[PDB]
Amino acid sequence: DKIKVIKVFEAFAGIGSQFKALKNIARSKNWEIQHSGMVEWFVDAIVSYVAIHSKNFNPKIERLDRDILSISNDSKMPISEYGIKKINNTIKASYLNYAKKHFNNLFDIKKVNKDNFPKNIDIFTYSFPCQDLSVQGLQKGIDKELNTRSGLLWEIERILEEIKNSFSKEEMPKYLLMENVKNLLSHKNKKNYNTWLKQLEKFGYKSKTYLLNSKNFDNCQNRERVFCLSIRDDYLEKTGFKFKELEKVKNPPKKIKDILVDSSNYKYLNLNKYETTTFRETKSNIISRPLKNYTTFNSENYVYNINGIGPTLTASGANSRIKIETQQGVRYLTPLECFKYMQFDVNDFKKVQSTNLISENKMIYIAGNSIPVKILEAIFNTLEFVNN
DNA sequence: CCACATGTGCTGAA
DNA sequence: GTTCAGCGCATGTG
Ligand SMILES: Nc1ncnc2c1ncn2[C@@H]1O[C@H](CSCC[C@H](N)C(=O)O)[C@@H](O)[C@H]1O
Ligand code: NA
Protein backbone atom coordinates (compact mmCIF):
# COMPACT_ATOMS: atom_id res chain seq x y z
CA ASP A 1 0.00 0.00 0.00
CA LYS A 2 1.26 3.49 0.90
CA ILE A 3 2.48 1.75 4.10
CA LYS A 4 5.55 3.47 5.53
CA VAL A 5 8.28 1.39 7.17
CA ILE A 6 9.37 3.06 10.42
CA LYS A 7 12.86 2.03 11.55
CA VAL A 8 13.17 2.81 15.27
CA PHE A 9 16.31 2.88 17.42
CA GLU A 10 15.87 2.95 21.20
CA ALA A 11 18.87 4.09 23.25
CA PHE A 12 18.39 3.18 26.92
CA ALA A 13 15.45 1.11 25.70
CA GLY A 14 14.34 -0.35 29.04
CA ILE A 15 11.22 -2.46 28.42
CA GLY A 16 10.48 -0.56 25.21
CA SER A 17 7.64 1.81 26.00
CA GLN A 18 8.75 3.69 22.86
CA PHE A 19 8.35 0.55 20.73
CA LYS A 20 5.05 -0.29 22.44
CA ALA A 21 3.66 3.20 21.71
CA LEU A 22 4.67 2.95 18.05
CA LYS A 23 3.06 -0.49 17.60
CA ASN A 24 -0.14 0.77 19.28
CA ILE A 25 -0.63 3.64 16.79
CA ALA A 26 0.89 1.87 13.77
CA ARG A 27 -2.29 0.86 11.91
CA SER A 28 -3.98 4.26 12.46
CA LYS A 29 -0.89 5.90 10.90
CA ASN A 30 -0.49 3.18 8.23
CA TRP A 31 2.98 2.32 9.54
CA GLU A 32 4.95 -0.87 9.94
CA ILE A 33 7.32 -0.59 12.88
CA GLN A 34 10.73 -2.23 12.52
CA HIS A 35 13.65 -2.72 14.93
CA SER A 36 16.61 -0.72 13.69
CA GLY A 37 18.38 -1.42 16.98
CA MET A 38 18.54 -0.72 20.70
CA VAL A 39 20.83 -0.08 23.64
CA GLU A 40 20.03 -1.54 27.03
CA TRP A 41 22.49 -3.18 29.41
CA PHE A 42 20.14 -4.03 32.28
CA VAL A 43 19.55 -7.80 32.33
CA ASP A 44 16.01 -7.72 33.75
CA ALA A 45 14.99 -4.99 31.29
CA ILE A 46 16.52 -6.92 28.38
CA VAL A 47 14.73 -10.12 29.40
CA SER A 48 11.49 -8.24 29.96
CA TYR A 49 11.90 -6.36 26.67
CA VAL A 50 12.27 -9.66 24.81
CA ALA A 51 9.27 -11.22 26.58
CA ILE A 52 7.05 -8.22 25.73
CA HIS A 53 8.10 -7.59 22.12
CA SER A 54 9.21 -10.94 20.64
CA LYS A 55 7.08 -13.09 18.32
CA ASN A 56 7.70 -16.84 18.36
CA PHE A 57 10.76 -16.72 20.62
CA ASN A 58 11.36 -19.99 22.42
CA PRO A 59 13.68 -19.69 25.42
CA LYS A 60 16.14 -22.50 26.07
CA ILE A 61 19.43 -23.15 27.84
CA GLU A 62 22.21 -21.52 25.80
CA ARG A 63 25.80 -20.32 26.13
CA LEU A 64 25.97 -16.55 26.47
CA ASP A 65 27.53 -15.05 23.33
CA ARG A 66 31.20 -14.30 23.98
CA ASP A 67 30.96 -10.57 23.03
CA ILE A 68 28.02 -9.85 25.41
CA LEU A 69 30.30 -8.49 28.13
CA SER A 70 29.03 -5.04 29.13
CA ILE A 71 25.78 -5.78 30.99
CA SER A 72 24.43 -5.00 34.45
CA ASN A 73 22.41 -6.90 37.07
CA ASP A 74 21.44 -3.82 39.11
CA SER A 75 21.33 -1.25 36.21
CA LYS A 76 24.06 0.92 37.86
CA MET A 77 27.28 -1.12 37.85
CA PRO A 78 28.81 -3.51 35.31
CA ILE A 79 28.51 -7.23 36.09
CA SER A 80 31.62 -9.13 37.22
CA GLU A 81 33.30 -12.09 35.46
CA TYR A 82 31.55 -14.34 37.99
CA GLY A 83 28.11 -12.91 37.24
CA ILE A 84 28.67 -13.43 33.53
CA LYS A 85 29.54 -17.10 34.22
CA LYS A 86 26.31 -17.52 36.23
CA ILE A 87 24.28 -16.33 33.21
CA ASN A 88 26.19 -18.63 30.83
CA ASN A 89 24.41 -21.97 30.26
CA THR A 90 20.96 -20.80 31.39
CA ILE A 91 17.60 -19.96 29.79
CA LYS A 92 18.25 -16.31 30.70
CA ALA A 93 21.23 -16.34 28.30
CA SER A 94 18.92 -17.02 25.34
CA TYR A 95 16.97 -13.84 26.14
CA LEU A 96 20.25 -11.88 25.97
CA ASN A 97 21.41 -13.68 22.80
CA TYR A 98 17.99 -12.99 21.22
CA ALA A 99 18.11 -9.26 22.05
CA LYS A 100 21.49 -9.14 20.32
CA LYS A 101 20.51 -11.24 17.31
CA HIS A 102 16.90 -10.28 16.52
CA PHE A 103 16.71 -6.73 18.01
CA ASN A 104 20.29 -5.59 17.33
CA ASN A 105 20.89 -4.68 20.97
CA LEU A 106 24.34 -3.09 21.34
CA PHE A 107 23.94 -3.16 25.15
CA ASP A 108 26.33 -0.40 26.25
CA ILE A 109 25.97 3.17 24.93
CA LYS A 110 29.76 3.58 25.20
CA LYS A 111 30.16 0.81 22.61
CA VAL A 112 27.91 2.56 20.06
CA ASN A 113 29.72 4.34 17.22
CA LYS A 114 29.65 5.19 13.48
CA ASP A 115 30.64 1.65 12.45
CA ASN A 116 27.68 -0.02 14.26
CA PHE A 117 25.03 2.73 14.49
CA PRO A 118 22.31 2.00 11.90
CA LYS A 119 21.71 4.31 8.95
CA ASN A 120 18.41 5.83 7.82
CA ILE A 121 16.79 5.64 11.24
CA ASP A 122 13.33 7.16 11.25
CA ILE A 123 13.00 7.56 15.02
CA PHE A 124 15.85 7.70 17.53
CA THR A 125 14.76 7.61 21.18
CA TYR A 126 16.95 8.37 24.19
CA SER A 127 15.28 8.20 27.58
CA PHE A 128 18.65 8.60 29.32
CA PRO A 129 19.18 7.89 33.05
CA CYS A 130 17.21 10.09 35.46
CA GLN A 131 18.88 9.18 38.78
CA ASP A 132 21.24 12.17 39.03
CA LEU A 133 18.44 14.55 37.91
CA SER A 134 15.47 13.35 40.06
CA VAL A 135 14.45 15.54 43.01
CA GLN A 136 14.08 12.29 45.03
CA GLY A 137 17.81 11.49 44.52
CA LEU A 138 21.13 13.12 45.44
CA GLN A 139 21.02 15.60 42.52
CA LYS A 140 24.58 15.12 41.29
CA GLY A 141 23.53 16.62 37.94
CA ILE A 142 24.99 16.20 34.47
CA ASP A 143 28.25 18.17 34.55
CA LYS A 144 30.60 16.49 32.05
CA GLU A 145 33.51 16.44 34.54
CA LEU A 146 31.59 14.37 37.09
CA ASN A 147 30.77 11.44 34.75
CA THR A 148 27.39 10.70 36.35
CA ARG A 149 24.88 8.19 34.96
CA SER A 150 22.50 10.95 33.82
CA GLY A 151 25.61 12.39 32.13
CA LEU A 152 25.46 9.47 29.68
CA LEU A 153 23.45 12.07 27.78
CA TRP A 154 26.89 13.18 26.56
CA GLU A 155 27.47 9.78 24.89
CA ILE A 156 24.56 10.68 22.63
CA GLU A 157 26.53 13.84 21.79
CA ARG A 158 29.57 11.69 20.95
CA ILE A 159 27.51 9.36 18.75
CA LEU A 160 25.81 12.16 16.81
CA GLU A 161 29.14 13.95 16.35
CA GLU A 162 30.69 10.76 14.93
CA ILE A 163 27.86 9.89 12.53
CA LYS A 164 27.58 13.47 11.24
CA ASN A 165 30.95 13.17 9.45
CA SER A 166 30.43 9.66 8.02
CA PHE A 167 26.71 9.55 7.19
CA SER A 168 25.11 11.50 4.41
CA LYS A 169 22.61 14.10 5.63
CA GLU A 170 19.81 11.75 4.51
CA GLU A 171 21.28 8.82 6.49
CA MET A 172 21.06 10.74 9.80
CA PRO A 173 18.04 9.98 12.02
CA LYS A 174 14.86 11.78 10.90
CA TYR A 175 13.43 12.34 14.37
CA LEU A 176 15.01 12.24 17.84
CA LEU A 177 13.04 11.94 21.10
CA MET A 178 14.45 12.66 24.55
CA GLU A 179 12.66 11.84 27.80
CA ASN A 180 13.65 12.69 31.35
CA VAL A 181 12.39 13.97 34.70
CA LYS A 182 10.96 17.42 35.42
CA ASN A 183 13.98 18.53 37.44
CA LEU A 184 15.96 18.57 34.16
CA LEU A 185 14.58 22.12 33.80
CA SER A 186 15.81 23.28 37.26
CA HIS A 187 18.08 26.33 37.63
CA LYS A 188 21.27 24.28 38.10
CA ASN A 189 20.32 21.85 35.31
CA LYS A 190 19.11 24.52 32.82
CA LYS A 191 22.65 25.47 31.81
CA ASN A 192 23.52 21.90 30.79
CA TYR A 193 20.14 21.39 29.08
CA ASN A 194 20.59 24.57 27.03
CA THR A 195 24.11 23.42 26.11
CA TRP A 196 22.56 20.21 24.74
CA LEU A 197 19.92 22.10 22.70
CA LYS A 198 22.62 24.21 20.99
CA GLN A 199 24.45 21.00 20.01
CA LEU A 200 21.30 19.46 18.54
CA GLU A 201 21.04 22.71 16.61
CA LYS A 202 24.71 22.37 15.55
CA PHE A 203 23.95 18.78 14.43
CA GLY A 204 21.21 20.11 12.09
CA TYR A 205 18.08 19.50 14.18
CA LYS A 206 15.16 21.74 15.08
CA SER A 207 13.72 20.90 18.48
CA LYS A 208 10.84 21.69 20.82
CA THR A 209 10.80 21.04 24.56
CA TYR A 210 7.56 19.73 26.12
CA LEU A 211 6.68 19.41 29.82
CA LEU A 212 3.86 16.87 29.84
CA ASN A 213 1.87 15.33 32.66
CA SER A 214 0.62 11.76 32.18
CA LYS A 215 -2.66 12.68 33.87
CA ASN A 216 -3.56 14.65 30.73
CA PHE A 217 -2.99 11.55 28.59
CA ASP A 218 -5.69 9.08 29.69
CA ASN A 219 -3.85 8.12 32.89
CA CYS A 220 -4.53 8.09 36.63
CA GLN A 221 -0.96 9.10 37.50
CA ASN A 222 0.64 12.43 38.24
CA ARG A 223 3.90 12.21 36.31
CA GLU A 224 5.50 15.27 34.74
CA ARG A 225 8.21 14.50 32.21
CA VAL A 226 10.37 16.58 29.87
CA PHE A 227 10.39 15.63 26.21
CA CYS A 228 12.64 17.09 23.55
CA LEU A 229 11.35 16.21 20.09
CA SER A 230 13.83 16.90 17.30
CA ILE A 231 13.44 16.80 13.51
CA ARG A 232 16.28 16.87 10.98
CA ASP A 233 16.13 20.40 9.54
CA ASP A 234 15.96 19.38 5.86
CA TYR A 235 13.35 16.68 6.57
CA LEU A 236 11.22 19.38 8.21
CA GLU A 237 11.44 21.36 4.95
CA LYS A 238 10.54 18.34 2.79
CA THR A 239 7.65 17.11 4.96
CA GLY A 240 6.22 20.48 6.02
CA PHE A 241 6.09 19.16 9.60
CA LYS A 242 5.03 21.47 12.43
CA PHE A 243 5.32 20.99 16.18
CA LYS A 244 1.90 20.65 17.80
CA GLU A 245 1.18 22.36 21.13
CA LEU A 246 1.00 19.26 23.32
CA GLU A 247 1.16 21.11 26.66
CA LYS A 248 -2.43 22.37 26.15
CA VAL A 249 -3.91 18.88 25.63
CA LYS A 250 -6.36 17.86 28.39
CA ASN A 251 -7.97 14.46 27.86
CA PRO A 252 -10.76 13.18 30.12
CA PRO A 253 -9.45 12.37 33.59
CA LYS A 254 -8.86 8.84 34.86
CA LYS A 255 -8.97 7.47 38.40
CA ILE A 256 -6.82 4.83 40.13
CA LYS A 257 -10.14 2.95 40.50
CA ASP A 258 -10.19 2.35 36.73
CA ILE A 259 -7.02 0.20 36.57
CA LEU A 260 -7.38 -1.90 39.73
CA VAL A 261 -7.62 -5.69 39.45
CA ASP A 262 -10.05 -7.57 41.70
CA SER A 263 -8.66 -10.29 43.97
CA SER A 264 -9.69 -12.33 47.02
CA ASN A 265 -6.13 -12.84 48.23
CA TYR A 266 -4.38 -9.46 48.44
CA LYS A 267 -2.17 -8.64 51.43
CA TYR A 268 -3.34 -5.62 53.43
CA LEU A 269 -1.26 -3.34 55.62
CA ASN A 270 -1.89 -3.01 59.33
CA LEU A 271 -2.11 0.72 59.97
CA ASN A 272 -4.23 0.66 63.16
CA LYS A 273 -1.31 2.13 65.15
CA TYR A 274 -1.00 5.29 62.98
CA GLU A 275 -3.08 8.45 63.41
CA THR A 276 -4.41 10.00 60.19
CA THR A 277 -6.72 12.73 58.85
CA THR A 278 -9.38 13.35 56.22
CA PHE A 279 -8.49 12.98 52.57
CA ARG A 280 -7.60 16.29 50.90
CA GLU A 281 -7.55 16.91 47.13
CA THR A 282 -4.77 19.08 45.71
CA LYS A 283 -4.85 21.25 42.59
CA SER A 284 -3.36 18.32 40.63
CA ASN A 285 -6.25 15.89 41.49
CA ILE A 286 -4.13 13.83 43.94
CA ILE A 287 -6.35 12.85 46.87
CA SER A 288 -4.31 11.71 49.87
CA ARG A 289 -4.09 11.54 53.65
CA PRO A 290 -0.97 11.33 55.84
CA LEU A 291 0.02 8.70 58.39
CA LYS A 292 1.43 10.22 61.58
CA ASN A 293 4.55 8.59 63.10
CA TYR A 294 4.85 6.12 60.19
CA THR A 295 8.35 7.12 59.03
CA THR A 296 10.61 10.18 58.87
CA PHE A 297 10.53 10.00 55.03
CA ASN A 298 7.71 12.27 53.84
CA SER A 299 6.92 10.53 50.54
CA GLU A 300 6.42 7.17 52.33
CA ASN A 301 3.74 8.59 54.68
CA TYR A 302 0.71 8.84 52.36
CA VAL A 303 -2.30 6.69 51.55
CA TYR A 304 -4.02 7.58 48.30
CA ASN A 305 -7.73 7.67 47.49
CA ILE A 306 -8.70 5.62 44.45
CA ASN A 307 -11.17 8.27 43.17
CA GLY A 308 -8.35 10.59 42.13
CA ILE A 309 -4.95 10.16 40.55
CA GLY A 310 -1.85 8.76 42.19
CA PRO A 311 1.74 9.89 42.60
CA THR A 312 4.64 9.37 40.23
CA LEU A 313 5.69 5.72 40.19
CA THR A 314 9.39 5.54 40.93
CA ALA A 315 11.58 2.50 40.34
CA SER A 316 12.34 2.07 44.04
CA GLY A 317 11.66 3.30 47.55
CA ALA A 318 8.66 5.28 48.69
CA ASN A 319 6.95 5.94 45.36
CA SER A 320 7.35 2.31 44.24
CA ARG A 321 5.23 1.41 47.31
CA ILE A 322 1.98 3.23 46.49
CA LYS A 323 -0.58 2.66 49.26
CA ILE A 324 -4.23 2.83 48.19
CA GLU A 325 -7.38 2.65 50.32
CA THR A 326 -9.93 0.08 49.16
CA GLN A 327 -13.02 -1.33 50.86
CA GLN A 328 -11.01 -4.48 51.73
CA GLY A 329 -8.28 -2.31 53.36
CA VAL A 330 -5.08 -0.46 52.47
CA ARG A 331 -2.62 -2.22 50.16
CA TYR A 332 0.17 -1.48 47.69
CA LEU A 333 -0.45 -1.28 43.95
CA THR A 334 0.61 -4.67 42.58
CA PRO A 335 3.23 -5.27 39.88
CA LEU A 336 0.43 -5.94 37.36
CA GLU A 337 -1.29 -2.73 38.44
CA CYS A 338 2.03 -0.84 38.19
CA PHE A 339 2.41 -2.04 34.58
CA LYS A 340 -1.12 -0.76 33.91
CA TYR A 341 -0.21 2.49 35.73
CA MET A 342 2.48 2.99 33.07
CA GLN A 343 -0.08 2.10 30.36
CA PHE A 344 1.30 -1.28 29.40
CA ASP A 345 -1.43 -3.91 29.22
CA VAL A 346 -2.11 -7.13 31.15
CA ASN A 347 -0.64 -9.25 28.34
CA ASP A 348 2.71 -7.40 28.52
CA PHE A 349 2.79 -8.15 32.24
CA LYS A 350 1.82 -11.81 31.87
CA LYS A 351 4.67 -12.29 29.39
CA VAL A 352 7.21 -10.79 31.81
CA GLN A 353 5.73 -12.82 34.67
CA SER A 354 5.76 -15.97 32.51
CA THR A 355 9.55 -15.78 32.10
CA ASN A 356 9.88 -16.72 35.80
CA LEU A 357 13.09 -14.63 35.88
CA ILE A 358 11.92 -11.25 37.21
CA SER A 359 10.96 -10.77 40.88
CA GLU A 360 7.95 -8.66 41.91
CA ASN A 361 10.11 -5.71 43.03
CA LYS A 362 12.15 -5.96 39.82
CA MET A 363 8.93 -5.83 37.76
CA ILE A 364 7.96 -2.65 39.61
CA TYR A 365 11.53 -1.34 39.20
CA ILE A 366 11.47 -1.64 35.40
CA ALA A 367 7.93 -0.22 35.22
CA GLY A 368 9.06 2.71 37.38
CA ASN A 369 11.96 3.32 35.00
CA SER A 370 9.63 3.40 31.97
CA ILE A 371 7.40 6.07 30.33
CA PRO A 372 3.58 6.15 30.27
CA VAL A 373 2.86 4.70 26.84
CA LYS A 374 0.01 7.01 25.78
CA ILE A 375 2.18 10.13 26.19
CA LEU A 376 4.51 8.65 23.57
CA GLU A 377 1.50 7.73 21.41
CA ALA A 378 0.41 11.39 21.43
CA ILE A 379 3.93 12.61 20.61
CA PHE A 380 4.41 10.05 17.83
CA ASN A 381 1.04 10.99 16.29
CA THR A 382 2.50 14.40 15.35
CA LEU A 383 5.30 12.93 13.20
CA GLU A 384 5.16 13.08 9.39
CA PHE A 385 7.13 10.99 6.88
CA VAL A 386 7.61 11.17 3.10
CA ASN A 387 5.99 8.44 0.98
CA ASN A 388 9.16 7.46 -0.98
C1' DC B 1 11.00 33.86 57.23
C1' DC B 2 6.25 30.85 56.43
C1' DA B 3 2.91 26.90 54.27
C1' DC B 4 2.28 23.77 50.58
C1' DA B 5 3.36 20.32 46.79
C1' DT B 6 5.91 16.46 45.35
C1' DG B 7 9.55 12.93 43.99
C1' DT B 8 12.08 7.21 36.80
C1' DG B 9 16.09 7.67 44.88
C1' DC B 10 19.82 5.74 48.11
C1' DT B 11 22.33 2.15 50.83
C1' DG B 12 24.31 -0.95 54.69
C1' DA B 13 22.94 -4.74 57.73
C1' DA B 14 22.17 -9.32 57.18
C1' DG C 1 28.35 -9.97 45.42
C1' DT C 2 22.42 -9.32 46.67
C1' DT C 3 18.35 -6.98 48.62
C1' DC C 4 14.91 -3.83 50.47
C1' DA C 5 13.25 -1.48 54.93
C1' DG C 6 14.35 2.51 56.69
C1' DC C 7 15.57 6.90 55.71
C1' DG C 8 15.22 13.49 54.10
C1' DC C 9 15.44 17.20 51.81
C1' DA C 10 15.78 19.49 47.27
C1' DT C 11 13.18 22.53 44.23
C1' DG C 12 9.98 24.77 43.48
C1' DT C 13 5.06 28.10 43.94
C1' DG C 14 2.59 31.49 46.43
N1 LIG D 1 26.20 2.61 30.27
C1 LIG D 1 24.96 2.24 29.84
N2 LIG D 1 24.77 1.71 28.61
C2 LIG D 1 23.54 1.34 28.19
N3 LIG D 1 22.41 1.45 28.91
C3 LIG D 1 22.46 1.97 30.16
C4 LIG D 1 23.77 2.40 30.70
N4 LIG D 1 23.54 2.87 31.93
C5 LIG D 1 22.20 2.75 32.16
N5 LIG D 1 21.55 2.22 31.11
C6 LIG D 1 20.08 1.95 31.04
O1 LIG D 1 19.32 3.11 30.72
C7 LIG D 1 17.95 2.87 31.06
C8 LIG D 1 17.22 4.19 31.35
S1 LIG D 1 15.50 3.86 31.55
C9 LIG D 1 14.64 4.50 30.15
C10 LIG D 1 13.23 3.88 30.13
C11 LIG D 1 12.90 3.11 28.85
N6 LIG D 1 12.66 4.11 27.76
C12 LIG D 1 11.71 2.16 29.01
O2 LIG D 1 10.83 2.02 28.16
O3 LIG D 1 11.56 1.45 30.01
C13 LIG D 1 17.98 1.89 32.23
O4 LIG D 1 17.16 0.74 31.98
C14 LIG D 1 19.45 1.50 32.36
O5 LIG D 1 19.59 0.11 32.59
NA1 NA E 1 30.35 -6.38 51.83
Side-chain angles (χ1 to χ4, degrees), chain A residues 43-285:
Chain A
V43 170
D44 298 284
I46 297 161
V47 166
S48 299
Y49 188 104
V50 166
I52 292 169
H53 298 293
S54 65
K55 331 177 197 174
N56 290 115
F57 164 59
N58 288 311
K60 41 171 274 276
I61 296 180
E62 294 181 358
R63 301 196 220 95
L64 187 60
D65 277 19
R66 297 183 314 284
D67 59 326
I68 302 180
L69 290 154
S70 188
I71 45 179
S72 175
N73 271 330
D74 61 7
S75 88
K76 322 283 181 199
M77 298 301 290
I79 287 179
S80 49
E81 267 196 8
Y82 171 89
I84 290 180
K85 281 185 76 219
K86 181 170 173 283
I87 294 166
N88 191 60
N89 306 120
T90 64
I91 288 172
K92 169 180 276 182
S94 67
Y95 285 84
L96 269 39
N97 290 337
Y98 192 85
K100 175 180 160 203
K101 187 154 194 61
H102 287 253
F103 298 140
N104 190 33
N105 186 18
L106 305 173
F107 297 97
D108 185 1
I109 197 65
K110 305 263 189 69
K111 306 297 203 204
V112 181
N113 60 55
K114 59 155 169 80
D115 303 305
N116 65 18
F117 188 78
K119 299 187 195 183
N120 303 301
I121 287 159
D122 297 306
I123 301 171
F124 174 80
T125 74
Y126 61 115
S127 175
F128 72 95
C130 58
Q131 81 160 38
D132 305 284
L133 294 163
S134 174
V135 293
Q136 191 76 294
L138 299 172
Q139 304 198 40
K140 218 102 75 182
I142 50 169
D143 283 349
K144 258 175 142 163
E145 300 91 326
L146 308 178
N147 301 134
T148 66
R149 296 202 316 112
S150 291
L152 291 175
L153 177 63
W154 308 120
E155 293 288 320
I156 310 304
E157 187 180 53
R158 183 187 56 74
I159 288 161
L160 290 176
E161 209 143 61
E162 281 189 39
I163 64 170
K164 182 140 202 67
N165 295 335
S166 301
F167 289 16
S168 66
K169 182 80 187 178
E170 298 79 29
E171 285 169 343
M172 298 285 287
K174 321 270 200 301
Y175 291 92
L176 327 173
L177 180 57
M178 188 199 79
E179 181 269 352
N180 219 285
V181 300
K182 183 179 166 190
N183 201 50
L184 179 56
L185 305 173
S186 74
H187 197 91
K188 289 171 180 170
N189 294 333
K190 261 292 204 183
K191 179 56 184 296
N192 279 313
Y193 183 58
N194 288 339
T195 304
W196 175 237
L197 292 177
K198 293 283 293 190
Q199 294 291 305
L200 285 171
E201 220 175 54
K202 158 180 162 182
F203 294 139
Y205 287 86
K206 296 294 179 190
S207 304
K208 182 166 183 68
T209 298
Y210 299 105
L211 178 62
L212 299 174
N213 191 329
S214 186
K215 83 189 181 170
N216 298 316
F217 293 94
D218 195 31
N219 204 5
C220 54
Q221 179 185 170
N222 180 68
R223 193 202 191 83
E224 297 182 76
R225 289 296 181 268
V226 182
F227 298 93
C228 185
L229 177 58
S230 304
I231 185 172
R232 203 181 66 208
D233 65 6
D234 74 301
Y235 204 71
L236 165 75
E237 292 170 23
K238 186 167 195 178
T239 55
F241 161 94
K242 309 184 185 176
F243 292 106
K244 300 279 154 281
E245 292 284 46
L246 295 172
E247 296 190 0
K248 300 177 195 186
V249 172
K250 306 256 201 198
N251 290 300
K254 214 193 198 188
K255 306 178 170 200
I256 295 163
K257 211 179 210 176
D258 302 317
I259 63 158
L260 298 182
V261 176
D262 290 328
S263 191
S264 281
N265 284 260
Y266 282 147
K267 309 159 201 149
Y268 295 90
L269 304 173
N270 189 337
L271 305 174
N272 301 325
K273 169 175 186 56
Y274 308 109
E275 302 94 334
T276 195
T277 69
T278 60
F279 279 112
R280 312 289 220 94
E281 180 168 0
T282 64
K283 61 212 182 193
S284 66
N285 196 203

Side-chain angles (χ1 to χ4, degrees), chain A residues 1 42 197 253 293 299 345 375:
Chain A
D1 216 24
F42 181 32
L197 292 177
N293 310 325
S299 42
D345 50 56
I375 299 173

Side-chain angles (χ1 to χ4, degrees), chain A residues 12-18 39-42 45 75 107-110 127-129 149 152 366 369-371:
Chain A
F12 315 106
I15 66 186
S17 46
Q18 305 279 5
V39 190
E40 180 55 63
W41 83 327
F42 181 32
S75 88
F107 297 97
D108 185 1
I109 197 65
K110 305 263 189 69
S127 175
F128 72 95
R149 296 202 316 112
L152 291 175
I366 63 193
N369 262 349
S370 185
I371 303 162

Side-chain angles (χ1 to χ4, degrees), chain A residues 302-337:
Chain A
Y302 290 102
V303 175
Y304 297 94
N305 189 296
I306 65 182
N307 294 295
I309 70 175
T312 287
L313 179 72
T314 61
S316 63
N319 277 36
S320 77
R321 296 186 284 265
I322 302 169
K323 296 182 291 307
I324 56 169
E325 189 183 284
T326 69
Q327 291 204 144
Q328 296 166 291
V330 178
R331 65 169 179 86
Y332 296 125
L333 288 175
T334 64
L336 167 45
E337 288 168 343

